[PDB]
Amino acid sequence: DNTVNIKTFDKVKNAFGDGLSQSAEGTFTFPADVTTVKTIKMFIKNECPNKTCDEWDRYANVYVKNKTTGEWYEIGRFITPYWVGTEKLPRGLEIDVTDFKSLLSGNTELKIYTETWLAKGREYSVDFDIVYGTPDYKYSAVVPVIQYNKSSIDGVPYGKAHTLGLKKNIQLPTNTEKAYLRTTISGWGHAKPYDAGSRGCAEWCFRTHTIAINNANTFQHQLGALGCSANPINNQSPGNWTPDRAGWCPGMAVPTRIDVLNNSLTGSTFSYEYKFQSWTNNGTNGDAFYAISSFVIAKSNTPISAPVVTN
Numbered sequence: 001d002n003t004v005n006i007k008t009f010d011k012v013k014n015a016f017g018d019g020l021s022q023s024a025e026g027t028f029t030f031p032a033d034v035t036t037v038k039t040i041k042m043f044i045k046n047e048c049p050n051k052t053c054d055e056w057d058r059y060a061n062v063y064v065k066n067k068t069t070g071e072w073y074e075i076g077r078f079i080t081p082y083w084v085g086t087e088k089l090p091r092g093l094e095i096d097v098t099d100f101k102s103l104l105s106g107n108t109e110l111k112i113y114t115e116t117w118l119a120k121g122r123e124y125s126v127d128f129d130i131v132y133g134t135p136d137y138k139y140s141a142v143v144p145v146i147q148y149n150k151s152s153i154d155g156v157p158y159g160k161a162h163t164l165g166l167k168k169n170i171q172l173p174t175n176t177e178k179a180y181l182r183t184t185i186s187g188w189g190h191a192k193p194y195d196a197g198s199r200g201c202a203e204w205c206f207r208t209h210t211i212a213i214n215n216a217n218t219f220q221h222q223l224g225a226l227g228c229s230a231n232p233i234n235n236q237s238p239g240n241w242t243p244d245r246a247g248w249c250p251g252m253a254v255p256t257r258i259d260v261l262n263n264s265l266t267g268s269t270f271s272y273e274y275k276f277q278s279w280t281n282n283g284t285n286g287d288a289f290y291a292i293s294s295f296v297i298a299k300s301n302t303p304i305s306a307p308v309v310t311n
Contacts, residue, residue, distance in 0.1 A: 001131055002132045002133075004129075006030060008110060009026060009112060011123055011125055012124055013123045014114035024111065027108065028109075032106050036133065039130075040098045040100070040130050041095070041131075042127075043091045044076070044078065044086070044092045044095070044125075045086055045091070045092030045124060045127075053085065053121065053123065054118040057080055058115045059114075059115040059152040059188070060115065061149065062112050063075060064100055064103045065108070065111070073103065077184050077186065077253065077293075078093050079249070079250045080122055080250070081231075081241065082239020083235075086251075092125075093252070095253050095256070099142055115152055136299070137300055138300075139303055140298065140300075142306070143308075143309055144293065144294070145170065146165070146166065148164060148290075149291040149292060156292065158189070158276060160281050168310065169270070170272055170309050171307055171308040171309075171310075172265065173267070173298060173304050173305050175302050176304065176307075179266065179296060179297065179299070180261055180296075181211065181257075181272075183256075183259070183293070184254055184294075185292040185293075187202025187203055187289065188203055188290075190286060191287060191288040199246075201288040202289060206222075207223045207277045209221045209274065209276050210277075211275070211294075212275055213270060228252075231252060261296075274292065274294060296309070
């Protein structure tokens with residue numbers, strides 16, 4: 001297994017106000033053949049010497065553009081650490097993006113965004129390690145099921161009525177050999193009523209959501225304690241970095257959840273539904289939202305087309 005490293009963004013800035021952009025885009029060249037790709041890792045480095053950056057814990061994410069549809073697909077999400085950058089981590093934050101190998105090839109458009117509200121913003125460098133070898137499956141295709149993830153407050157309203165579709169029908173190519181879902185979810189808000197411990201939703205309140213397949217509860221996503229106090233990025237004081245949030249920590253990547261689908265669904269049309277654990281916002285302390293992206297990945301040893309997602 002030979003590994004090649006590809007540099008992309010180099011010290012790009014995400015910032016706000018007076019001629020600035022919270023996002024940055026660029027075109028980069030990746031190798032064209034991915035049939036040999038075993039793994040692809042993305043590394044995000046953020047240098048923030050001397051308190052020169054927006055000091056808050058901000059929502060940030062990276063997308064790749066699907067040339068075929070023109071849509072941006074979220075491939076990685078993280079929360080900036082308080083006060084400092086990723087200096088304690090020699091390579092920066094690491095996120096496995098192998099699932100998107102079909103799009104990471106040739107001339108590729110990437111975009112990086114930070115929900116920063118200050119001119120100091122954050123500055124990043126992003127690189128990818130591509131590992132060649134002999135994969136289980138040579139071919140893969142990926143498509144979104146839902147993407148309500150433009151920002152922390154642009155996600156799905158939690159505890160209030162909304163009009164967003166959370167159910168879809170998915171159709172996998174008949175020659176699919178393996179399929180699975182890739183979900184990234186993170187909550188925002190200190191909304192009341194609080195759970196015990198004064199934990200408001202959706203940032204602090206521990207919840208377990210469910211993915212239903214064909215109407216049967218199939219996968220559970222526990223948004224629990226990751227152990228923020230053990231963050232190797234531990235030079236965040238005086239920021240409130242050590243308490244556990246529900247499913248995330250400041251200065252860490254938001255976890256990627258992979259749910260393997262039953263083969264019996266292959267070459268069929270099935271329903272998908274993301275169900276949030278029941279809760280009602282009393283509205284006395286702000287709102288709550290869950291930012292989520294969920295994609296279906298289909299793999300095969302024969303060339304495969306994209307699954308079809310419909311309402």
